[PDB]
Design a binder for this molecule. Structure first.
Ligand SMILES: CCCCCCCCCCCCCCCCCC(=O)O
Ligand SMILES: CCCCCCCCCCCCCCCCCC(=O)O
Ligand SMILES: [Cl-]
Ligand SMILES: [Cl-]
Ligand SMILES: [Cl-]
Ligand SMILES: [Cl-]
Ligand SMILES: [K+]
Lengths: 242, 259, 286, 242, 286, 91, 49, 49, 48
């Protein structure tokens, strides 16, 4: 026979090896495919769909989880107050974990691109006001006040005039890709911080609630990609599935 | 003449940024972004072999101590592959099955084995010597535990156009009394039959055998994304969850104003 | 080579390797508004008229076309049953209004199953019962009025193949199952016991990955979603299988000051589109 | 030698593997083939040939099996009577098992297509009458009476005028293929039910028998195919074949 | 490569793989009225005349041509014996009528073996005995008359290579064998003891997969089947081997009212077609 | 013939007939013999066996073949050998 | 019989010989015997930089 | 299968052998390279300093 | 739930102060005499 030499790797079973295997059923033809709406080809299509962010992820509402899906805004008596803050790391533990973008991010080691956070005000038509939403690139901690937060990337939103606004978190990084940030050396990859402040005030006439809620959603923009497919930390198995 | 008148979403690389949606709310520079989108193609996401079954044939004990096992093919017993698949409602694909066999501690011995695919309706082996092992029509694989893992390609076999991880209905008509609620959500179009294994001999083998089956999805198509499982899995055939401990999807913190 | 690969018949071309006569034995190889973001009718006083009924919306950019696909009759290339189907048209493709629900400050949320909701309603119901095979799309219209001083937000979504699960006895040890009245509640719909996980172990927070629309009281009073037929088979039993569920969940709770109208209802109006039936015999209720 | 790496599958013997093997006899030439009538190339050719259906498959005639090959029709005193009923599942236990179509179906997991059931009246030339033969698609049980059965697919047969009639059981299914139906979840694949009723009556003049028999045969039409070859349940081996 | 594959010489072309000099070592590869439904003479008072004899039928669409092939003399491409054969023609290709059988209300059924039926009849018989090699087709004509008040149905079929089996001692423990008078009953034919399994462990219900015709008393009184020569060799011994059996089985029993003629016979008339013989020597009876 | 007794629609049916080609039905290896050479006992205890080639001892392959009267083919024989309990030794 | 699994940063690490992570449904794993030739694989350039 | 004969060298691991190995990550694309001053291609460039 | 089976229009009086319901001519006869109790109820137009 033809002279051959077996090389290292011989007999090994590599789970990601894309080879050919003997077909068990000769001449078999499958049921033809029929048209079905909703086919997807690339996970990025899903990452670009907005899903709800659990900004209000408090230890005190774990037993009434629905309350995690929106956060409060209300009449302030002191100006320039901080309404909410959270990190902008899509694959990190926290608010982003509830989004499908966050969950798909966890099936990859690295990501890159701009993100979008949409805020939807669900108070009454009679309530009006302006908020300042800021994205602070890496460098410190949560800005201590509005006059510090406004030095970064930000948008001023009038929720009286428009119920939804979108804050674009532009890709601002040293590296072309970021591994998922977490305490320790990997904080090197943190995206930064998002804060929402009262620009003017939440105002209402007599007869309307003085507290309302905002729903925040997040998705990736078209320049977002992921790299190095891996298993997620968000599903385990401690016992038999029966 | 007529009496009655009434009768691709994701391109090969990441979008570039043009100098002044970033370039809509902030001033931007030009970035010639050539980051690839290939690794998130569903084919690369799914075509990785994952564990779908662990079959044991011990020599001592109270189960499968006769050198043969008929394993009803149900691929929803392992959380990792299950959650990935359940990201979609329908999936169509061929599959590569790999059979990693060893004794319970990982040692290998010179033992001959037979794996037979028994499609729905084919007679199942009832002993290590059953006539069904003649396998004159069913496909069988004879392999030694000292050989590399056996491996075969299985085509898309459903009577339907795709396998479906979620079937909101019942398999048949009738009253649907409480006593039969196990029927709910059971899709026969996913029921691929039995996988039968035995040590090849009329005399009993002295070796306890553990078979780990891995499946690699290939030539895949997927339809209708859905929310990803956020509660531990409990059962193979339904999405039941532990009501007394509903997990929040995200970790918690003390205040909404501090990290 | 036999052209028996699972990907045979798709628009995408893959470059694979093979050593056997069957194509499915080959390696996976390599390849070589958005359908998922709820495309508006435009992206793909207003009045939608169908049959002898008319509803009134406002904009076409306010109508979601699920997965960007308009309902259609089954094409010959996908059909399998050989009898000529019956397409009754105006007697079945028209708007049907179900029992109204009452939105309270502490409401959990509701769901309805399709086509279960109409199997006992009108000529559509009769056809669904007299035929083994059924198929159709739907125009789903959810209505909720409130004043400019009320507030709240409903997420209205269509979840294909909405399989329900149980709390497994609370402890998770009991392999209990949802009873018939829960899986197919009929026209009146049903209430969610754990909306956060949609009574099925999956996050409500990601439900927007499905065709949906928000009814934010301060901006709109209705949601309209057009749904194409979705299934792994071209026709199916209207009795045994519900192709999708409609979910209406108050993500931002209803609120208003004492004295403002507290009776705030939610009404569901739906119209089958391109409904067709086959496999005629006697009427079967279930 | 040429660098090679052995892959998983190495050394395995897959019974359906279509490979090449060393020829034991070099230069050997077989006896040439001669023309022989009746060559067949595809099992479907056999599935299209009608064979007898054991509609009268009673526990009480197992010891006189010939009686299973035809069923009775006779003068009725009450109108609209049910003469016989049976399922239309070709690969299911019951009447179809006696047909070669049924037996070949058992060598496959799934089937698809229209079927044909031919009824041959073997009473006398002087006997006449009309029967209503119906195919009821899936949904319920045996229609309780003729006025219910006639709502489905059916043909009215005058056995006085024509000795044989063919009922076409058109392919009416949700799925493109059906696995063989049987009690349990697989009843999802049932084809439906066939019933034969008296439309008028079996009538005779003085001098002719008041009871006669009908032979039923079944075959597949040209649009019938089978898929996923497998072993049959209809042959076993409990002892040595000597 | 040596062209020694078993499929060599067939109309179908297969695409196979090979690594050896012999074609049969190759893989199976892949490929790249109806003959079995008893084709009528048309699909491929009437009078069929052959030799000095004439029978009278009615229609050509009532004559079955087994496997769609008309009898023919052995072609040179298939012949192997080198002597010039004798083709006596009219003295042997003509109609011979055997002993008549009596159909009773409880008759089981009968069979005849070919060419055994005629090895001792006429010039055909003599040629069959004087020659080692024989070959021919047959026109089989079964006759049964009854009145318009009688009823019954005979299945008349031709089963090539009709090997008979025994009841194995009843218990199945005895490896007994059919005796000579049972395997080759001659002109008078024989009676089936278990017609349901054709005395050979195979179902009578599937016998229609073979060339056949029904004699349904209310419609017809005769069956005619034309049978081509079938064997794995071009010529063979008329004594040692019966190429096929003729089966006449009452699937629907004979019936009539008391007083109607009860003597209902069944008569078999057969004509060798294209009979040829070779390997001449002395007469051998068996 | 459906479109003869009932009203039909058009169905572009592309279901394959290849799997029922006799080649695919038959070209699947099946058991045809089990030969034993025990060391103890009263048969074939001398380390050799002459097995008269008769392939009709196993029901499954036999019934498939007997669906036909005559069959012509080449055959691939595979010899799976082991000790009675399935263990293998250097023999 | 042995298993080698590449666990990228952020993937759950095995905490026992039986941990669920060995299901390796996404991470790449190599199953090999100590009697086989040395296992061998190619790893691409993986830095974010 | 194709007739082959294993030759001496079979199964050996030669550290300088320049062969091909199975890639552990299908469809993976690395961070693109950016221009960096000071690239060297041959050690002789350093020996001349 | 019974009335909605007929010809109908859904009106949002918040958004539009006026709406028009068209009562299309749906009759067996080409003309109707004026309906009233008794045989002439044969000519009734229906109900709003
Ligand atoms: C010769 C040995 C080969 C046998 C390998 C086992 C084959 C098992 C059938 C493969 C079916 C793959 C589709 C699985 C669909 C999921 C069904 C489910 O678990 O709900
Ligand atoms: C070198 C070892 C190779 C020997 C393999 C055994 C070869 C046996 C001969 C093959 C004959 C195949 C045709 C069988 C025909 C059936 C005969 C019968 O059993 O009635
Ligand atoms: Cl065996
Ligand atoms: Cl519950
Ligand atoms: Cl006998
Ligand atoms: Cl494991
Ligand atoms: K680009």
């Amino acid at each position: 026979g033809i002279p051959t030499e077996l090389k290292p790797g011989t007999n090994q079973f590599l789970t990601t090896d894309d080879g050919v295997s003997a077909p068990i059923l000769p001449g078999f033809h499958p049921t033809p495919p029929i048209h079905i709406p909703g086919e997807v080809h690339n996970l990025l299509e899903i990452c670009r769909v907005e899903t709800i962010l659990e900004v209000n992820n408090l230890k005190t509402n774990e037993t009434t989880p629905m309350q995690r899906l929106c956060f409060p805004v209300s009449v302030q008596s002191k100006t320039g107050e901080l309404c909410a803050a959270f990190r902008a790391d899509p694959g990190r533990d926290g608010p982003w974990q509830s989004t499908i973008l966050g969950q798909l991010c966890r099936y990859y080691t690295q990501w890159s691109g701009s993100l979008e956070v949409t805020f939807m005000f669900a108070g009454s038509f009679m309530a009006t006001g302006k908020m300042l939403i800021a994205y602070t690139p890496p460098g410190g901690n949560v800005p201590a006040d509005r006059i510090t937060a406004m030095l970064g990337t930000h948008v001023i939103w009038d929720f009286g005039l428009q119920s939804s606004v979108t804050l674009v978190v532009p890709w601002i990084s040293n590296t072309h890709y970021r591994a998922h940030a977490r305490a320790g050396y990997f904080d090197y990859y943190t995206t930064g911080i998002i804060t929402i402040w009262y620009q003017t005030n939440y105002v209402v006439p007599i007869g309307a609630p003085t507290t309302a809620y905002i729903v925040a959603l997040a998705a990736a923009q078209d320049n977002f990609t992921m790299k190095l497919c891996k298993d997620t930390e968000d599903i385990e198995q401690t016992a038999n599935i029966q | 003449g007529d009496p009655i008148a009434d009768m691709l979403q994701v391109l090969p690389t990441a979008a570039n940024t043009e100098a002044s949606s970033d370039k809509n709310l902030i001033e931007t520079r030009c970035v010639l972004n050539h980051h690839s989108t290939q690794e998130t193609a569903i084919g690369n996401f799914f075509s990785r072999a994952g564990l779908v079954s662990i079959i044991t044939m011990p020599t001592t004990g109270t189960q499968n101590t006769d050198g043969y096992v008929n394993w009803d093919i149900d691929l929803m017993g392992y959380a990792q592959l299950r959650r990935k698949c359940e990201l979609f409602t329908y999936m169509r694909f061929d599959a590569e099955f790999t059979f990693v066999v060893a004794k319970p501690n990982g040692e290998l011995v010179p033992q001959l084995l037979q794996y037979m695919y028994v499609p729905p309706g084919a007679p199942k082996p009832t002993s290590r010597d059953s006539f069904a092992w003649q396998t004159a029509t069913n496909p069988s694989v004879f392999v030694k535990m000292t050989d590399p893992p056996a491996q075969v390609s299985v085509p898309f076999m459903s009577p339907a156009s795709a396998y479906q991880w979620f079937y909101d209905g019942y398999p048949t008509f009738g009253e649907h009394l409480q006593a039969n609620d196990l029927d709910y959500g059971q899709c026969p179009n996913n029921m691929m039959g039995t996988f039968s294994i035995r040590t090849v001999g009329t005399e009993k083998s002295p070796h306890s055998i553990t078979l780990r089956v891995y499946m690699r999805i290939k030539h895949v198509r997927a339809w209708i994304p859905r929310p990803l499982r956020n509660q531990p899995y409990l059962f193979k055939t339904n999405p039941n969850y532990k009501g007394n401990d509903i997990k929040c999807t995200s970790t918690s913190r003390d205040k909404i104003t501090t990290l | 080579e036999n052209s028996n690969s699972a990907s045979e018949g798709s628009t995408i071309n893959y470059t694979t390797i093979n050593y056997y006569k069957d194509a499915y034995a080959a390696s996976a190889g390599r390849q070589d508004a958005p359908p998922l973001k709820s495309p508006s009718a435009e992206a793909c006083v207003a009045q939608l008229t169908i049959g002898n009924s008319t509803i009134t919306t406002q904009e076409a950019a306010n109508i979601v076309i699920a997965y960007g696909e308009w309902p259609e009759y089954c094409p010959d290339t996908d059909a399998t049953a050989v009898d000529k189907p019956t397409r009754p048209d105006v007697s079945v493709n028209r708007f049907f209004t179900l029992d109204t629900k009452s939105w309270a400050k502490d409401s959990k949320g509701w769901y309805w199953k399709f086509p279960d909701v109409l199997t006992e309603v009108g000529v559509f119901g009769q056809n669904a019962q007299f035929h083994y095979l059924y198929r159709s799309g739907f125009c789903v219209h959810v209505q909720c009025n409130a004043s400019k001083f009320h507030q709240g937000a409903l997420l209205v979504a269509v979840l294909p193949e909405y399989v329900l699960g149980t709390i497994a006895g609370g402890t998770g040890n009991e392999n209990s199952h949802p009873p018939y009245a829960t899986t197919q509640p009929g026209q009146v719909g049903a209430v969610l016991t754990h909306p956060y996980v949609l009574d099925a172990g999956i996050p409500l927070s990601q439900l927007t990955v499905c065709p949906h629309q928000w009814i934010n009281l301060r901006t709109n009073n209705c949601a309209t979603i057009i749904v194409p037929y979705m299934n792994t088979v071209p026709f199916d039993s209207a009795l045994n299988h519900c192709n999708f569920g409609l979910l209406v969940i108050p993500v931002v709770p209803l609120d208003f000051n004492t004295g403002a109208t507290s009776e705030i209802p939610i009404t569901v109006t739906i119209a089958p589109m391109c409904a067709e039936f086959a496999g005629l015999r006697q009427a079967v209720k279930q």
